[PDB]
Design a protein around this ligand. Structure first.
Ligand SMILES: [Mg+2]
Ligand SMILES: [Mg+2]
Ligand SMILES: [Mg+2]
Ligand SMILES: [Mg+2]
Ligand SMILES: [Mg+2]
Ligand SMILES: [Mg+2]
Ligand SMILES: [Mg+2]
Ligand SMILES: [Mg+2]
Ligand SMILES: [Mg+2]
Ligand SMILES: [Mg+2]
Ligand SMILES: [Mg+2]
Ligand SMILES: [Mg+2]
Ligand SMILES: [Mg+2]
Ligand SMILES: [Mg+2]
Ligand SMILES: [Mg+2]
Ligand SMILES: [Mg+2]
Ligand SMILES: [Mg+2]
Ligand SMILES: [Mg+2]
Ligand SMILES: [Mg+2]
Ligand SMILES: [Mg+2]
Ligand SMILES: [Mg+2]
Ligand SMILES: [Mg+2]
Ligand SMILES: [Mg+2]
Ligand SMILES: [Mg+2]
Ligand SMILES: [Mg+2]
Ligand SMILES: [Mg+2]
Ligand SMILES: [Mg+2]
Ligand SMILES: [Mg+2]
Ligand SMILES: [Mg+2]
Ligand SMILES: [Mg+2]
Ligand SMILES: [Mg+2]
Ligand SMILES: [Mg+2]
Ligand SMILES: [Mg+2]
Ligand SMILES: [Mg+2]
Ligand SMILES: [Mg+2]
Ligand SMILES: [Mg+2]
Ligand SMILES: [Mg+2]
Ligand SMILES: [Mg+2]
Ligand SMILES: [Mg+2]
Ligand SMILES: [Mg+2]
Ligand SMILES: [Mg+2]
Ligand SMILES: [Mg+2]
Ligand SMILES: [Mg+2]
Ligand SMILES: [Mg+2]
Ligand SMILES: [Mg+2]
Ligand SMILES: [Mg+2]
Ligand SMILES: [Mg+2]
Ligand SMILES: [Mg+2]
Ligand SMILES: [Mg+2]
Ligand SMILES: [Mg+2]
Ligand SMILES: [Mg+2]
Ligand SMILES: [Mg+2]
Ligand SMILES: [Mg+2]
Ligand SMILES: [Mg+2]
Ligand SMILES: [Mg+2]
Ligand SMILES: [Mg+2]
Ligand SMILES: [Mg+2]
Ligand SMILES: [Mg+2]
Ligand SMILES: [Mg+2]
Ligand SMILES: [Mg+2]
Ligand SMILES: [Mg+2]
Ligand SMILES: [Mg+2]
Lengths: 95, 59, 134, 71
RNA sequence: UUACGGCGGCCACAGCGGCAGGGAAACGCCCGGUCCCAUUCCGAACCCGGAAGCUAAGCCUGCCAGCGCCGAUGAUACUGCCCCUCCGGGUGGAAAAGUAGGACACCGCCGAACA
RNA sequence: UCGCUCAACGGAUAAAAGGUACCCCGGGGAUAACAGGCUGAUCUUCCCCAAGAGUCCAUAUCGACGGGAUGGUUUGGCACCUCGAUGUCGGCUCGUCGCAUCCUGGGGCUGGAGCAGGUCCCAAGGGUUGGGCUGUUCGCCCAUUAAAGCGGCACGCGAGC
RNA sequence: UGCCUCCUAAAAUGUAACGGAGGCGCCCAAAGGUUCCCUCAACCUGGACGGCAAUCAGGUGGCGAGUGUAAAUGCACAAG
RNA sequence: CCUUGAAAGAGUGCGUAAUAGCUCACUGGUCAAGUGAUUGUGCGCCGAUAAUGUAGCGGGGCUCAAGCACACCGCCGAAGC
RNA sequence: GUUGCGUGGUUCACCGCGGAGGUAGAGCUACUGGAUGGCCGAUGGGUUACUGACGUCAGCCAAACUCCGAAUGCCGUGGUGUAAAGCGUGGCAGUGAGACGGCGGGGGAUAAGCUCCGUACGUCGAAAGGGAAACAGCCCAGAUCGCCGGC
């Protein structure tokens, strides 16, 4: 449906997030009833295309480097001036 | 472990804490080198005065 | 536009720094004017822009002014030396930061709405752009 | 305009962990911004002096910020 | 050790509200105003003397997130010191709000019943 | 323990106001008036947007409400040189420069029939009168003219008047 | 022009201007000391004159009242 | 507001004071590899404008860069070392 | 500041630990004010087509608003480092007109080579040498003397 390939962040911080956003990634977090959050980089342009095509209610079926787990979008941190997505909150869904 | 710290820039225009951290480390003039242990007390001084020195891990 | 009361008649100048953090998205209409730089927007300029929008659309639609000029600015009399007490308030100002949404508009026709907002933008002492509610 | 009164030099004079003598002034204040704990008397103008030697210790006492001295 | 009455710790994750349940001792309402004592009037309250009645209320137990409360991770605002003309960047700290969620408390001593 | 609007409130005496253009001396560019310098609110010259007027027609012409600048000739702000001295308005004589052009020269548009004009662009070679009034600059008036420009230079110029 | 309170004041103290706002040159013989007791304002409903608001009754109300007098810091455990 | 129909406005702007007249909205066929709008950025253009003399690279000169961005290799350079 | 006599690491720097805050930011159905748009609509207005109380749903603002709340700075303490730190007491002073630059503010028009404060900030003053064409206050760097050495 909405396929998206993501990876787990190596380092977390301010400079790390700036580096990711300049390299074209979207730093994001995936929590939920799994009681443990993952820190990820969503691809910038691909995720933006997925989001524009079908809206925010889209069920982002994404796969981690080895495993698969479909997710949902909780909220997006939009920068005011550049009007780009800075951060995305994702919650796990059990079908 | 040990470190070798070399003064690269001058203390003219340096602030009080930077000047005193250099004095505590033991650096006198430009291109002078000292040998110091690698502990938290030493890395604090190096962090304060990093832009004035060159630190390399040599014995 | 003038506030009915102010608790403090003479105030320090509002500080011109930072990106806006509240009111940075279109909330009441479909089209809006977003500020791209700091400035002090006066009630005179606000009324000029509102009149421009209304006379371009001429009918229909709704215009929202989601800023208010409540910060006062003082002025000494003309030919006076420095420093004999602060002057009396003579301007009313809204403190506008980049990202702030100034005016909002709802109108059926895209071209007329955009032209009206450009009319308004040419009255403000700021570089501004037109944004939509996605 | 143009008038003002003198600065009264209020505030905390001895911080947590300091070893005080009996009679040390700990806090100059208006009202009970801090309240007296054990071995701490208040004073006529809300001064929170020390009644015993020991170390100053700040804490919470169900809404009130209190100053105490441990022997 | 269990389960009731007191004295504290702590001061909302403990509070407010809602719905059910209980009376062995105890806590209570309760019955009276001769006695100590009391009402800016009133035995309502405070005090004294009792034991007909009752768990209806207080009190205690269980269940409810309704109102309130707490609340991350990540991101952001801001910022120390550097690089740098600004724009910005590096390195070290890091919110408030919001979200996931938590939560209808916990602990100590004494007495009674049970042991 | 008493006696002080000693309120100029660390309280010169118990006891106290003014003028000086008749003024003098010691100092100061630590501080004003002129000129220079910085600024540019005010002023000046432009411009952006285009509500309208122009019968119709925003943009021949004028352009409200607002916005942005230029210049440094106005009135100012600051007090940076000059107080063991940097002469101050107007006129005269002699000039020199800028162009934001008054005439003459060349053009576009016109709500330019022609003659006349309006507006904008280019252009600084030369020219740009004589009187009445006022100390006047400025201004008004009279008679002409192709025209009777605007400014800078210590508001040019007093060891030139 | 002395004193008191706040902001400027850059989260210790301190900090200037002919900067922004205010008070003081007293009052109380109880408005001091101590012991004991109580909880306000506002809102709702009912009630002769009585009404938006006097007194009464019942609810709700954790501090929005009050504090001799400015402001600030305090005070419901009450400093009311 | 409706209609022949390949297509076919009581009109797109001057233009008629008016009925005129001109163009143009929307299609039929030819030729045949391309054709628009907008978002963000690098470097550029105009706006531009004072009075002794070029006079807003210090000068000569410089785009065959001796300019700008990024990457790299040397060297010069103080009374510093 | 210097100097005599005492004291001797007490000073200062870094690390760790114990502390008080209400600035930046933010937020406001957490207060005092300001304030936009809906809905309900008190009155006032002429059956109410005008005003729009109090509420309520969204979006906001404040040096003298605060349910909140940093980074820094400050106080104490334990380690480590550092000659020409610190403290007491005497002799002898000078100074008490500051200037610019960076960062945070007031006055000013958020003008000034303007003015007034803050800043274990810098430089000049009282600092020569190199760079900035020239050019106290900007960048680099602190001249004991010599050298026809080097980086
Ligand atoms: Mg906000
Ligand atoms: Mg504009
Ligand atoms: Mg004070
Ligand atoms: Mg007293
Ligand atoms: Mg029983
Ligand atoms: Mg009774
Ligand atoms: Mg019961
Ligand atoms: Mg029951
Ligand atoms: Mg966090
Ligand atoms: Mg939070
Ligand atoms: Mg609960
Ligand atoms: Mg005096
Ligand atoms: Mg005096
Ligand atoms: Mg006397
Ligand atoms: Mg003399
Ligand atoms: Mg002169
Ligand atoms: Mg002058
Ligand atoms: Mg001169
Ligand atoms: Mg200018
Ligand atoms: Mg026309
Ligand atoms: Mg135009
Ligand atoms: Mg002077
Ligand atoms: Mg003179
Ligand atoms: Mg001389
Ligand atoms: Mg010309
Ligand atoms: Mg012509
Ligand atoms: Mg004609
Ligand atoms: Mg000429
Ligand atoms: Mg010739
Ligand atoms: Mg001349
Ligand atoms: Mg002259
Ligand atoms: Mg003469
Ligand atoms: Mg003369
Ligand atoms: Mg002469
Ligand atoms: Mg001469
Ligand atoms: Mg303060
Ligand atoms: Mg302070
Ligand atoms: Mg401070
Ligand atoms: Mg007074
Ligand atoms: Mg009393
Ligand atoms: Mg009392
Ligand atoms: Mg030029
Ligand atoms: Mg070399
Ligand atoms: Mg040397
Ligand atoms: Mg802290
Ligand atoms: Mg405060
Ligand atoms: Mg703020
Ligand atoms: Mg509020
Ligand atoms: Mg604040
Ligand atoms: Mg001495
Ligand atoms: Mg003096
Ligand atoms: Mg002085
Ligand atoms: Mg400053
Ligand atoms: Mg200022
Ligand atoms: Mg100055
Ligand atoms: Mg001065
Ligand atoms: Mg400074
Ligand atoms: Mg001197
Ligand atoms: Mg030098
Ligand atoms: Mg020095
Ligand atoms: Mg030099
Ligand atoms: Mg030397």
């Amino acid at each position: 449906s909405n396929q998206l390939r993501v990876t787990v962040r190596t380092e977390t911080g301010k400079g790390a997030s700036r580096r990711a956003r300049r390299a074209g990634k979207i730093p994001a977090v995936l929590y939920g009833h799994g009681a443990e959050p993952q820190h990820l980089e969503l691809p910038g342009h691909d995720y933006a295309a997925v989001l524009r095509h079908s809206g925010t209610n889209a069920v982002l079926t994404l796969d981690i480097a080895g495993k698969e787990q479909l997710a949902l979008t909780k909220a997006l941190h939009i920068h005011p001036i550049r009007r780009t997505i800075q951060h995305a909150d994702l919650l796990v869904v059990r079908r | 472990s040990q470190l070798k710290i070399t003064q690269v820039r001058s203390t003219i225009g340096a602030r009080w804490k930077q000047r005193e951290s250099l004095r505590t480390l033991g650096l006198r003039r430009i291109r002078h080198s000292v040998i110091r242990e690698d502990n938290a007390a030493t890395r604090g001084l190096i962090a304060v005065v990093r832009h004035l020195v060159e630190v390399e891990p040599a014995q | 536009l003038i506030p009915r009361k102010v608790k403090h008649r003479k105030q320090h100048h509002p500080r011109q720094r930072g990106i806006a953090s509240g009111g940075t998205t279109v909330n009441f209409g479909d089209y809006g004017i977003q500020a791209l730089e700091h400035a002090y927007v006066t009630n005179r300029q606000i009324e000029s822009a509102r009149i421009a929008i209304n006379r371009h659309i001429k009918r229909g639609g709704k215009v929202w002014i989601n800023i208010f000029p409540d910060r006062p600015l003082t002025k000494k009399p003309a030919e006076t030396r420095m420093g004999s007490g602060k002057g009396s308030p003579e301007w009313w100002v809204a403190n506008v930061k980049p990202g702030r949404v100034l005016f909002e508009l709802s109108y059926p026709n895209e071209g007329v709405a955009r032209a009206a907002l450009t009319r308004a933008i040419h009255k403000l002492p700021i570089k501004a752009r037109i944004i939509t509610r996605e | 305009n143009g008038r003002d009164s003198a600065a009264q030099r209020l505030g905390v004079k001895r911080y947590g962990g300091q070893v005080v003598k009996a009679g040390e002034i700990l806090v100059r204040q208006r009202g009970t911004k801090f309240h007296p704990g054990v071995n701490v008397g208040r004073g006529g103008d809300d001064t929170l002096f020390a009644k015993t030697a020991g170390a100053v210790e700040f804490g919470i006492k169900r809404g009130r910020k209190t100053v105490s001295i441990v022997g």
